[PDB]
């Protein structure tokens, strides 16, 4: 795995020692090359994971996530170039180093073989994210949002740390391979119930769960564009990966313990999409959409069936790409008009047609138009839920309808109608912005052709 | 082009509007021209019957009862002119309307495709930029101390002065931009 | 109808609006950028018609036929045709034939 890790580390000295003019260029070139290197990991043996060394291993679950992270860094750099132009060279380098440290921590999380190392780096990801939000946010609420995000995640994680140490003391190892191979069943006891809660709750906080999702809207609305990109694309999927890995230990008790979280997610997706129908802030709308999709993923994980897991992985990747692109599209309009209110900017299709096309494609993927990987994941989750219970289809279909409604409603309000007369600062979309939207879209449409890459290990 | 509205509708104006609505709804019901003409002359006679009522209370009560009759007898699907609000073609070409300020963001090659028009546009920009200060001064002078009590705007008092707040009305997009 | 000030304002705006509209008219010349592919007179009547026909059906039909040859052979069951309706009558190989013996009444 060091083929990816060490160049990522070397990105930091290169960024620090590069000339003030060339920081973005050098970062982008080498991050794209690192992603090209990371593309090799997609080749996974069907029976067994790629165990590179004692510390690091990769499977068909970790590889798409690593590729997503490595692809996401250059996109974040392109998006964050514009609003950081006025910043001094040291501050821009510090921002880039926070991004690089975040990518490094995420790669090591997805590849770590030991649950305690996974926890250490998965909690380490908070520090760069918190610094980004609280230092380069543009509103006074960034401090409150950072506090909420940090404290929600830590309150979830600390019991996970205690439980992981207890597992190390009892079973004797936290290596995922050994745990999977030994994996003695749990018993229905209050001690085991609370171990299950401790293991599950940290990831349930990371994957915005209804009632634990309050941090996500504040964080995504208040963060800068790059921070929103990582939060939507990878930081939420950290919870999904953790839950999928950790579900091996808690085999039987999952059936009893899933019902609260299952019902919470199943109702919360409807509630959050209904919230999306009435949101007045574009970033907030996208955030609640992310909450709904992640609730679907939570349902898929809790069901613990092969089709559910495949759909969960597909939805994770597809949603990461779609949400990152949607945040980028919203950020462009925010830079142009300096407000996030949906109603303020109207009829932008006449002013910016290619951006309107990007918005159309992004919304179509968001509403899971086939054969998008979004729909592949969602449909697999729906079929798994139907096997779990035929009555799930009512809630799943209602959620799909509302997702279509709010996606096309955002598209209609922002990009259709009469142009706002008084706004005169709209200017032709830069090649950077269109390039960013294309870099988001083209991989997503391409992955439809070969879907086995993002269908996970159980494929 | 719409005139500034008044605080209230005078009784005469309300009667006129009711007459127009009634004639239009009757035309909607009376599809054929001859029948429409017959019943329209009947309606005109009905208005002329109480045209000269002296008691304003009586005239007001007649207006109220006539409005109730109109609401009962309104056509469920009254005819709407195609470009009128609620019409089939209302706001159809709105997306084609493009504000004039979009021109300033053109690339120089595109602006060189039509030099002469952009020279004329620069002349218009100079004119507006020169006239703005005098327009603001005129608006201050004519404005009452309490503040503008009506949306009406004064005309140009002196030669060489453009009408106050004229730019957008004059440079409003063409109805059929294409 | 309008107040005299209203009439004057409307007239002023009318004059200026007509001036704007007439200034929206282009000149006799629409400047354009300055032979990429030679095309003397090229029979658009039939030659270009044939070129369109070829490029749009003949090339695709060849490509699809080749892909059909590959795909059919590559995997079994790729092409499954409904068993042709063998009405009592000669077959190509089995040459089977049978008659219901009109065991019925003809009159109508």
């Amino acid at each position: 795995m060091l083929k990816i890790i060490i160049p990522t580390t070397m990105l930091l000295p290169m960024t620090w020692m590069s000339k003030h003019n060339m920081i973005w260029i050098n970062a982008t070139v080498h991050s794209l090359l690192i992603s090209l290197i990371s593309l090799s990991l997609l080749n996974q043996l069907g029976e067994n994971s790629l165990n590179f060394s004692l510390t690091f291993f990769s499977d068909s679950l970790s590889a798409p996530l690593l590729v997503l992270t490595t692809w996401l860094l250059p996109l974040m750099l392109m998006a964050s170039q514009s609003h950081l132009s006025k910043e001094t060279t040291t501050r821009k380098k510090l921002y880039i180093t926070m991004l690089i440290l975040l990518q490094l921590f995420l790669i090591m999380t997805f590849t770590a073989t030991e649950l305690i190392l996974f926890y250490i780096l998965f909690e380490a990801t908070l520090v760069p994210t918190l610094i980004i939000i609280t230092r380069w946010g543009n509103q006074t609420e960034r401090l409150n949002a950072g506090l909420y995000f940090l404290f929600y995640t830590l309150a979830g994680s600390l019991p996970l740390l205690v439980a992981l140490v207890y597992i190390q003391n009892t079973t004797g190892s936290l290596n995922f391979l050994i745990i999977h191979y030994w994996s003695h069943p749990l018993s229905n006891s209050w001690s085991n119930i609370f171990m299950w809660l401790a293991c599950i709750m940290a990831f349930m906080v990371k994957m915005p769960l209804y009632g634990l999702h309050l941090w996500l809207p504040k964080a995504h609305v208040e963060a800068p564009i790059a921070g929103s990109m990582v939060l939507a694309a990878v930081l939420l999927k950290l919870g999904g990966y953790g839950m999928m890995r950790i579900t091996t230990i808690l085999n039987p008790l999952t059936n009893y313990m899933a019902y609260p979280f299952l019902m919470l997610s199943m109702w919360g997706m409807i509630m959050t999409s209904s919230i999306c129908l009435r949101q007045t802030d574009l970033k907030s709308l996208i955030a609640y959409s992310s909450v709904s999709h992640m609730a679907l993923v939570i349902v898929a994980i809790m069901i613990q069936t092969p089709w559910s897991f495949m759909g969960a992985t597909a939805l994770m990747i597809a949603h990461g790409l779609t949400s990152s692109m949607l945040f980028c599209l919203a950020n462009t309009n925010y830079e142009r008009v300096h407000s996030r209110t949906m109603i303020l900017a109207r009829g932008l299709q006449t002013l910016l047609p290619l951006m309107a096309t990007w918005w159309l494609m992004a919304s179509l993927t968001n509403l899971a138009l086939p054969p998008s990987i979004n729909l592949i994941g969602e449909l697999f989750i729906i079929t798994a839920s139907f096997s779990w219970s035929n009555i799930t289809i009512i809630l799943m279909g209602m959620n799909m309808m509302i997702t279509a409604l709010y996606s096309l409603y955002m598209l209609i309000t922002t990009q259709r109608g009469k142009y706002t007369h008084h706004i005169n600062n709209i200017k032709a979309s830069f090649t950077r912005e269109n390039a960013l939207m294309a870099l988001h879209i083209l991989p997503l449409l391409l992955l439809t052709l070969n879907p086995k890459m993002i269908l996970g290990p159980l494929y | 082009a719409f005139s500034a509205p008044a605080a209230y509708l005078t009784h005469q104006q309300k009667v006129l509007r009711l007459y127009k609505r009634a004639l239009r709804h009757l035309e909607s019901w009376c599809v054929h021209r001859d029948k429409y003409r017959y019943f329209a002359c009947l309606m005109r006679a009905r208005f002329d019957e109480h045209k000269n009522e002296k008691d304003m209370v009586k005239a007001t009560q007649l207006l109220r009862q006539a409005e109730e009759e109109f609401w009962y007898g309104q056509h469920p699907q009254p005819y709407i002119f195609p470009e009128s609000p609620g019409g089939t073609s209302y706001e159809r070409y709105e997306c084609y309307k493009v504000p004039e300020w979009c021109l300033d963001d053109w690339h120089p090659s595109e602006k060189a495709m039509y030099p002469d028009y952009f020279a004329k546009r620069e002349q218009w920009k100079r004119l507006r930029r020169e006239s703005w200060e005098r327009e603001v001064k005129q608006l201050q002078e004519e404005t009452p101390p309490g503040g503008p009590r009506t949306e009406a705007l004064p005309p140009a008092r002196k030669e060489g002065d453009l009408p106050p707040l004229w730019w957008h009305i004059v440079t409003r997009p063409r109805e059929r931009p294409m | 109808g309008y107040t005299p000030d209203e009439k004057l304002r409307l007239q002023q705006l009318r004059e200026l609006r007509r001036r704007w509209l007439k200034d929206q008219e282009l000149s006799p010349r629409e400047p354009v950028l300055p032979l990429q592919d030679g095309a003397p007179w090229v029979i658009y009547k039939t030659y270009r018609h044939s070129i369109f026909a070829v490029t749009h059906v003949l090339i695709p039909v060849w490509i699809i036929h080749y892909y059909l040859k590959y795909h059919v052979t590559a995997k079994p069951y790729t092409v499954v045709e409904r068993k042709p309706r063998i009405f009592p009558g000669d077959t190509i190989l089995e040459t089977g034939e049978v008659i219901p013996l009109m065991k019925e009444f003809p009159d109508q």
Binding site: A428 | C102, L103 | -
Partner: peptide, 12 residues
């Protein structure tokens, strides 16, 4: 009698 058609920049 061609009338100018206002449109956003297309070079970019």
């Amino acid at each position: 009698k061609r009338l100018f058609i206002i449109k956003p920049s297309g070079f970019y």
